[PDB]
């Protein structure tokens, strides 16, 4: 089922040590009985390290640099701040400044600072995913998967603004404002529904839901045979995996293995922002209007 009927607790687990520097690990946190009814009850420890701190510090700087701007907009009034929270917006520099780093602060400079902070924040955290894996002797699938996501973000606020000739083409920091920018970005390029990457991207998004639905319900359906213990079922096929494979073979004609299903997985999700990134990159650099392009194919 979706919830455990009974919870059990033991001494806090400090984990595998492999090549990890145990000096950089925190201490275990409290146990949540709340988290316990769904998954593991154990909070922490977490690994700090140099990259974690840089990431974590730049991360907050980004968030705060935006935060002060919102307050400056709110007339430092906590009431307005709450009323107008989704309306505030930190916008990129005007098209006038181009790829200039000299825009005045109220006119776009503050946006550059925030972005610079985000840039470092994100890349350091990427390097963090990689190293954490290295130090345990694991594959770097997580860092590479992560790179896909990074691709779309790189393209939205960095690579495309640069290839277009101005930062003004980037995404503003704001709740309603980044929604508007999105809606508007499609209007300008002749309706993104004709961008075949966009369409591909949607297929993989829809698919991710389809698959994670399929995989999840399956593993639950056979957890009565210890299905969730996937690494050992990969190393020694249990009846759980057979029932799993056979349920699907009998339904739609072919099937996965336990290692296999997880390759379907990582690629279906990774293709969302991979294709995505490409659809957006060509948008406005090589193709000005996807409908017209749809008319020619060229």
């Amino acid at each position: 089922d979706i919830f455990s009927q009974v919870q059990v607790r033991g001494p806090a687990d400090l984990g595998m040590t492999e090549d990890v520097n145990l000096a950089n690990r925190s201490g275990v946190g409290p146990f949540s009985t709340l988290l316990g009814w769904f998954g593991n009850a154990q909070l922490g420890p977490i690994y700090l390290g140099s990259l974690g701190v840089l990431s974590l510090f730049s991360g907050l700087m980004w968030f705060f640099t935006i935060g002060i701007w919102f307050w400056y907009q709110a007339g430092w009034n906590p009431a307005v701040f709450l009323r107008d929270l989704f309306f505030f917006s930190l916008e990129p520099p005007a098209p006038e400044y181009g790829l200039s780093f000299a825009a005045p602060l109220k006119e776009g400079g503050l946006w550059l600072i925030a972005s610079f902070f985000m840039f470092v924040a994100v890349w350091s955290w990427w390097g963090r995913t990689y190293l954490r894996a290295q130090a345990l002797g694991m594959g770097k699938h997580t860092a590479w998967a992560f790179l896909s996501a990074i691709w779309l973000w790189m393209v939205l606020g960095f690579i495309r603004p640069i290839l277009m000739g101005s930062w003004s083409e980037a995404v503003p920091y704001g709740i309603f404002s980044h929604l508007d920018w999105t809606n508007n970005f499609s209007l300008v390029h002749g309706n993104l529904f004709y961008n075949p990457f966009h369409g591909l991207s949607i297929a993989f998004l829809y698919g991710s839901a389809l698959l994670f639905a399929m995989h999840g319900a399956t593993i639950l359906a056979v957890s009565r045979f210890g299905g969730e213990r996937e690494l050992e079922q990969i190393a020694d096929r249990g009846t759980a995996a057979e029932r799993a494979a056979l349920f699907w073979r009998w339904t739609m004609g072919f099937n996965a293995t336990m290692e296999g299903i997880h390759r379907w997985a990582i690629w279906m999700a990774v293709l969302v922002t991979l294709t995505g990134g490409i659809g957006i990159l060509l948008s406005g650099t090589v193709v000005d209007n996807w409908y017209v392009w749809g008319q020619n194919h060229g």
């Binding site: 984990g15 699938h141 073979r249 990582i266």
Partner: protein, 281 residues
């Protein structure tokens, strides 16, 4: 024909309807009574779709499109060429889907597993029924449904959206998107986690689930677990689709105005409604 370990599983029984009658296979596929049901509904539906295509005078799939009845017909029947054909086709789809679900149930039983897969699928089926049955009824004409055509359907989406402004402001739409993005994120991770443990560094031994558990605690200070990430996955997807239905079933029924405008409720709370400055003052 059989997987090296399949035979011991191919025993009689588990059928919901009709005993041993359709209790058999065709190549890898399991038939069952509902095996037959879905085939019949699928045959019929595709036929009708081709029939629509001649009345339309195109065989090109990018062009073919079967439209519902126009609003003037309300929730009554319409002539074939004028909307009947879509109505049957819709009946046939439903027939297909539901049947496909019940077959999943029948396979579940024969194998002795839970019913989580058929159950999860029913959410997909319910989203489809929302868009072609529940919303049009409630609105008052089959004409509010989306047409069956590759691009025409994308058009319905675009037109229906823009009717209420930027649809981005539909609040349940915001929530539904959150689950879609978050689910993908989680499918990305889960897959990557298991693979990296099963496929370590060159020459190293297969990692342990423990290593996995550790990798994550080190990364974000927490690890949900094997039975967890699988319940999680199931929850995000089912949820994504649940909210997707919700955002539509309310649109046009209990809210027909611009979605952005619905946010005025927040901004017009009397305690800050008149306070000057900001964006709205």
């Amino acid at each position: 024909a059989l997987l090296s370990f399949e035979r011991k599983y191919r025993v009689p029984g588990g059928t919901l309807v009709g005993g041993n009658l359709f209790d058999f296979w065709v190549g890898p596929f399991y038939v069952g009574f509902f095996g037959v049901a879905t085939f019949f509904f699928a045959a019929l539906g595709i036929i009708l779709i081709a029939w629509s295509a001649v009345l339309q005078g195109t065989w090109n799939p990018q062009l073919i499109s079967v439209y519902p009845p126009a609003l003037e017909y309300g929730l009554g029947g319409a002539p074939l060429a004028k909307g009947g054909l879509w109505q049957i086709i819709t009946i046939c789809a439903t027939g297909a889907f539901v049947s496909w679900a019940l077959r999943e149930v029948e396979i579940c039983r024969k194998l002795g597993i839970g019913y989580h897969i058929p159950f999860a699928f029913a959410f997909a089926i319910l989203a489809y029924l929302t868009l072609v049955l529940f919303r049009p009824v409630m609105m008052g004409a089959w004409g509010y449904a989306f047409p069956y055509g590759i691009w025409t359907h994308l058009d319905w989406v675009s037109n229906t959206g823009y009717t209420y402004g930027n649809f981005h402001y539909n609040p349940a739409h915001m929530i539904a998107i959150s689950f879609f993005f978050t689910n993908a994120l989680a499918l990305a991770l889960h897959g990557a986690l298991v693979l990296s443990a099963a496929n370590p560094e060159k020459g190293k031994e297969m990692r342990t689930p423990d290593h996995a558990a550790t990798f994550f605690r080190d990364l974000v200070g927490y690890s949900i677990g094997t039975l967890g990430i699988h319940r999680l996955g199931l929850l995000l997807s089912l949820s994504a689709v649940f909210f997707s239905a919700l955002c539509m079933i309310i649109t046009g029924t209990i809210w027909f105005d611009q979605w952005v405008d619905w946010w005025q409720w927040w901004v017009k709370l009397p305690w800050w409604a008149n306070i000057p400055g900001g964006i709205n003052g």
